[PDB]
Design a protein around this ligand. Structure first.
Ligand code: HEM
Ligand code: HEM
Lengths: 446, 447
């Protein structure tokens, strides 16, 4: 009945609890203390953080709960606009882009992105092949170069050329700074706003220019931009307009780059921390990736790598939360009455540590947990969100992560040469900050 | 360019290939060997069996292909008449009945059938609650009792009372025998069969015509399709269905819905007992969702995983396993198979549903989670209910029924595959796991 609430700060309610550089980890510790549900109040904001599969399975009932824009998403909406991730389900552009983009994010569509993914993946492999002895890999840094470039290439046939750079492409700098400013707005500035508007303008100008260039040239590529320029929503018969296409492209970059790079970085982290798991994954990569360049079909065959990725997503879902609102008055879990519009936050990493689901060894990295999706209770594993508002890029992210992880495991032995201590940097996403490895090439050509 | 074709039998071409008691499974094996398309010739008949989503998505282009009456449907038409399933799209009575009946088959309309579905479902649950220990359930037999009676009740407020009988209601016996005779004619001293066929047609017509006439005479309104058809006017023509066509619709609902839906339930329960993890997940949902002695309509809609189970059973063994199309005009299929106007296509649904390019390598595995997010299914990859405007009008009915019933079964019983049942798919015009038997230990949850 009575819902726990973490410590309050007078008028600020719980908001100062998020004024910490690891808020998800803070919320997880709160969930450790308070359990499956706690109220979290901020000025002009009430939400409830859910951590148990028992409650989250109800929160994932789309007849009762719809996606809410968290404050994070609301701030990201200032530059992702009514792209898929930052639009309400009832916004015309959400359903329109969803209908248009769903076929281009399907598992089948991954066949068409595969070559571009391989392009960037090979650049990552070659970068690491070209390291000198006793040089090391900055893992999240390289993973992010890889995911940004892959989304740039598959998203709008644009090469950020992150592997040619120490300083990222200015758009990436603007996007990352915009995300940081969105994230900074949660925990709490006149310079920030001018910087924020400048970064939005940088993002809009580049993306609008690429769209305009593509419309002017009429060139067809295997990228999402082409699909969006040619796509018509079957429902309305309407295409996305150019502004929404821009917001989608920006959204793919926001939604996909750091989540996926975090996933790769955590996966490699857990792999090097779990040599038997790494050996099994590496054995699979060697057995499956028999060609110099992985095929799409081979990536699908990287089953254990897929389980590795799911288990990394289990422990550290890199988009660590999503928000829901009660569509109508409803009772959560038979004991928490919710009024229409009441907000829920799904604390995914805590969900993924529900011992009633995963057993006592929830902290252990055991990809074998995912051998059979049917053995996993409903809504126990939500790294890609829920229902129609689930990650549209899930197949993309998993394909890219499996491909890249498979190639990494094929081509290198990895050494946790610093005995890296997991330090999870929090933006709107999670990544193992300062995770570094040494990769001894297995000298397998590409 | 050149199209594969299975082995021939001289003058009979491929027809004797269907002279087997499992023709769909034979056609699937043929499709396994020949691939996404093969020509199938019989005397005076050429068709092409399609098995890939690539080709089937084009065949499902309604601007290019219309529903064709397969030979099966042509034979069924001898007793389903110009009911919806056995009429050509251009036949006045198809569009008329379609327009009249579409609203009575909508998801919303299931609210009005729900109570009578619950009535039969409760009878099924009570039957199983009343089995003695070590008695077992003949699953497709009870599922068929369940779907016939439900369609009887929701269709025309008529109780076949199948759970009071070993020998079915004479109407059902004639219908099943008529369907059997229709199916047997595909595979072919047939003079007794012809008299029996006409006798069974007359039995079916008489009961249904009598019920219609009784209903018009009494003026009674029920929550059944018959009332809707008696009161319905096609918005386009402004006409109601006439009594003969209403009869054919009623017969059609029974033909089209009873064995497909019972087969679906039987296969779903088969896959559940063969996949304990799935069963536990489905049972958990049924227990969590169905909190009342009687499931409500809204509760059935919440049986999402039960729905996924059903879709995954439909994926593997779509119980109306094929539908037929004809090219509306000259057209090229898949960029390499030229088709002339009128050329026939058969969509081999179980093969479509095993298209590894759509579903991955594990097409044979029963994984309801494939259907966890309906967005993940490509267009025309999953066609257990046919296509377009000629899709199954009873889809919402069938799924509501099957979800409700499966949910109640999973709520009320633990199921044991006590014989380690070996899947044996009997083929009529539909598919069912023949001899599928389970033991159901009641969870002793009252109704
Ligand atoms: C491992 C990598 C990824 C993870 C963990 C992830 C996570 C998520 C989550 C949890 C959501 C739901 C957000 C919410 O409910 O508020 C979501 C939505 C979304 N994601 Fe991902 N994502 C990943 C990769 C990607 C990629 C690569 C793309 C695009 C190329 C992408 C694009 C999107 C979009 C557009 C949405 C909004 C979907 C909608 O509401 O229609 N994500 N993602
Ligand atoms: C799981 C159960 C069912 C399955 C798999 C199924 C499958 C199908 C398929 C594949 C078709 C298209 C046939 C063709 O194109 O030749 C169809 C049509 C049809 N079905 Fe179902 N069916 C089911 C249940 C039902 C039920 C319960 C009813 C009625 C209560 C029903 C009534 C019809 C009718 C009337 C049509 C013809 C629709 C039209 O052409 O206007 N079916 N069904």
């Amino acid at each position: 009945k009575e819902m726990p609430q973490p410590k309050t700060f007078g008028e600020l309610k719980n908001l100062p609890l998020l004024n910490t550089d690891k808020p998800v980890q803070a919320l997880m510790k709160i969930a450790d203390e308070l359990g499956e549900i706690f109220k979290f109040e901020a000025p002009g904001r009430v939400t409830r953080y859910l951590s148990s599969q028992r409650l989250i399975k109800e929160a994932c009932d789309e007849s009762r709960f719809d996606k809410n824009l968290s404050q994070a998403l609301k701030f990201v909406r200032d530059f992702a606009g009514d792209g898929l991730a930052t639009s309400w389900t009832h916004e015309k552009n959400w359903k329109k882009a969803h209908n248009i983009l769903l076929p281009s994010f399907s598992q089948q569509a991954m066949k068409g992105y595969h070559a571009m993914m391989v392009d960037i993946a090979v650049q990552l492999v070659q970068k690491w092949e070209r390291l000198n002895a006793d040089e090391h890999i900055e893992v999240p840094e390289d993973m992010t170069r890889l995911t940004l470039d892959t989304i740039g290439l598959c998203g709008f046939n644009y090469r950020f050329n992150s592997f040619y750079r120490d300083q990222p492409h200015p758009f990436i700098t603007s996007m990352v700074r915009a995300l940081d400013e969105a994230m900074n707005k949660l925990q709490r500035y006149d310079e920030n706003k001018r910087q924020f508007q400048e970064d939005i303008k940088v993002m809009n100008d580049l993306v609008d220019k690429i769209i305009a260039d593509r419309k002017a040239s009429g060139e067809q590529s295997d990228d999402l931009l082409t699909h969006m320029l040619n796509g018509k929503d079957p429902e309305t018969g309407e295409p996305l307009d150019d502004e929404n296409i821009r917001y989608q492209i920006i959204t793919f970059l926001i939604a996909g780059h750091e989540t996926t790079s975090g996933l790769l970085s955590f996966a490699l982290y857990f792999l090097v921390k779990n040599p038997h798991v790494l050996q099994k994954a590496a054995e699979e990569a060697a057995r499956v990736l028999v060609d110099p360049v992985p095929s799409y079909k081979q990536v699908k065959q990287l089953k254990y790598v897929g389980m590795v990725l799911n288990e990394a997503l289990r422990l550290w879902p890199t988009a660590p939360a999503f928000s829901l609102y009660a569509k109508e008055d409803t009772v959560l879990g038979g004991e928490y009455p919710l009024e229409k519009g009441d907000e829920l936050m799904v604390l995914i990493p805590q969900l993924h540590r529900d011992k009633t689901i995963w057993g006592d060894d929830v902290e252990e990295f055991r990809p074998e947990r995912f051998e059979n999706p049917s053995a996993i209770p409903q809504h126990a594993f939500k790294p890609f969100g829920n229902g129609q508002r689930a990650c549209i890029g899930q197949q993309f992210a998993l394909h890219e992560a499996t491909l890249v992880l498979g190639m990494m495991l094929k081509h290198f032995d990895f050494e946790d040469h610093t005995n890296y201590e997991l330090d999870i940097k929090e933006t709107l996403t999670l990544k193992p900050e300062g995770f570094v490895v040494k990769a001894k090439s297995k000298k397998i050509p590409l």
